[PDB]
Amino acid sequence: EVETFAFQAEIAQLMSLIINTFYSNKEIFLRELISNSSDALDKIRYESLTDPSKLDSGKELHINLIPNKQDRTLTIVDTGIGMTKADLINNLGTIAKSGTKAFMEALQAGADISMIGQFGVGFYSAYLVAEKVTVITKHNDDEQYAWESSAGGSFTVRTDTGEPMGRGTKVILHLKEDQTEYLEERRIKEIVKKHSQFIGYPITLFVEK
Amino acid sequence: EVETFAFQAEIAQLMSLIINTFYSNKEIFLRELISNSSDALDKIRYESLTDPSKLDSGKELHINLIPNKQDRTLTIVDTGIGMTKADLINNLGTIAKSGTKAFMEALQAGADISMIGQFGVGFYSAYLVAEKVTVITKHNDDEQYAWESSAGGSFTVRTDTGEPMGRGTKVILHLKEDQTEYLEERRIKEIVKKHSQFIGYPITLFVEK
Ligand SMILES: COc1ccc(-c2snnc2-c2cc(Cl)c(O)cc2O)cc1
Ligand SMILES: COc1ccc(-c2snnc2-c2cc(Cl)c(O)cc2O)cc1
Ligand SMILES: [Mg+2]
């Protein structure tokens, strides 16, 4: 009961561009993922203003960054609105076919990879640093699902068997071998202070034994 | 059947700050409003990917800028998802109480008024240039409503009697007397090219007789 899907051709092309393009300022992936968490936190915050029971699955709106040097993973957890199975399958809630088109044109009209979030498809910048990304998500009244892709044209979706998350999304980045700087506390703190210093939810960087 | 509402105190404070603070780079209002139109266009585009009938109220996703020097108005029209009456009353679909708090703190931690969109409340930058803003909006399956406010602590909502809009939002800025530069074609073109050159929907600047 793992379902395997092909990416639409425009999204496979976006992913190949991100993986194959020489581009040294990889650290923008974290700004993009923290931005998406902030947008998801804004959404549950706005829904709660009229229906407080929407927070029954967790009242605290925040972001956790969890490095694990043994697993070579950096995990970003938020307690935002979460995604339904349909939204995961439909490009993680993004307008990715049209966004990808505009981004390609921009890149011709001069833009650079760091502008990717202006085209609605910043999630895929994860592949600047990760060989595999796993997305575990829970929206109120839908079940918990895990999406995962090592690129190559396909992704899987299954019902998740992990720990329950309450509500929100967890992005687990399985880092490339040469990208382990992004597990180091000083490097993560530096990038958060540089690019996410005004995000309006607490961001807690976990430490390791 | 005009309903009059008080702004929550944090939003009245945000509006007073924007109106009373000396700050010369007013032109950022247009970037903020065009951004909100783009976000609303992204939303109907994403809903249409799974339900095409959502576009029965208009298939074209675009933004029009309409200056009128006789009325001293600059109007921004989009054919995005639109807002329900509830969303208009609840601060135009924004998390404005919490966004306002963060923005105030940022402004202390050094930030400037141009960063307002990072706090979810960029709409209110309209009051850098407008004495009165009128917001006319139509979401699928809700009626067309007009919101309006000259600040001073209150806004009104009524069912709109204007021309039907199909779907989307129209922001009519009734400009301050000293802010008429923003009706001039070269000035609007300059600001769109400077700050909204990569927005992914057509932006048509209307001309005047
Ligand atoms: C910008 O488009 C977006 C589309 C969808 C989302 C949503 S809705 N629920 N979770 C996420 C989310 C998705 C991702 Cl990929 C993530 O990294 C963190 C998240 O909380 C956010 C932004
Ligand atoms: C950033 O938060 C936002 C909150 C709500 C919206 C939405 S949903 N439908 N219309 C608008 C909209 C609202 C405004 Cl004010 C506008 O200028 C243009 C619009 O299309 C957009 C952004
Ligand atoms: Mg945004």
Residue numbers in the entry:
A (entry chain A), B (entry chain A): 16 to 224
From the paper:
The molecular chaperone Hsp90 is responsible for the maturation and activation of specific client proteins that are key components of signal-transduction pathways that regulate growth and proliferation. The ATPase activity of Hsp90 is crucial for the activation of such client proteins. ATP binding to the N-terminal domain of Hsp90 leads to a series of structural changes that promote N-terminal dimerization, while binding Hsp90 inhibitors that target the ATP binding site of Hsp90 prevents these conformational changes and leads to the degradation of its client proteins. The present series of the 5-aryl-4-(5-substituted-2-4-dihydroxyphenyl)-1,2,3-thiadiazoles (ICPD 26, 34 and 47) were recently synthesized and shown to be effective Hsp90 inhibitors in terms of binding to Hsp90.
ICPD 26, 34 and 47 essentially bind to Hsp90 in the same way. A crucial network of hydrogen bonding between the resorcinol group and highly conserved amino-acid residues, Leu 48, Ser 52, Asp 93, Gly 97 and Thr 184, of the ATP-binding site is present as previously seen with pyrazole and isoxazole resorcinol inhibitors. Hydrophobic interactions that are also conserved include those with Asn 51, Ala 55, Met 98 and Phe 138. The main-chain carbonyl group of Gly 97 does not form a hydrogen bond interaction with the ICPD compounds. Although the ICPD compounds bind Hsp90 in similar ways, the Kd values for the binding of ICPD 26 and ICPD 47 (7.5 and 4.8 nM, respectively) and ICPD 34 (Kd = 39.0 nM) are very different, with ICPD 34 being less potent. ICPD 26 is similar to ICPD 34, except that it lacks a 3-methoxy group. With ICPD 26 and 47 this loop adopts a more compact conformation interacting with the bound inhibitor.
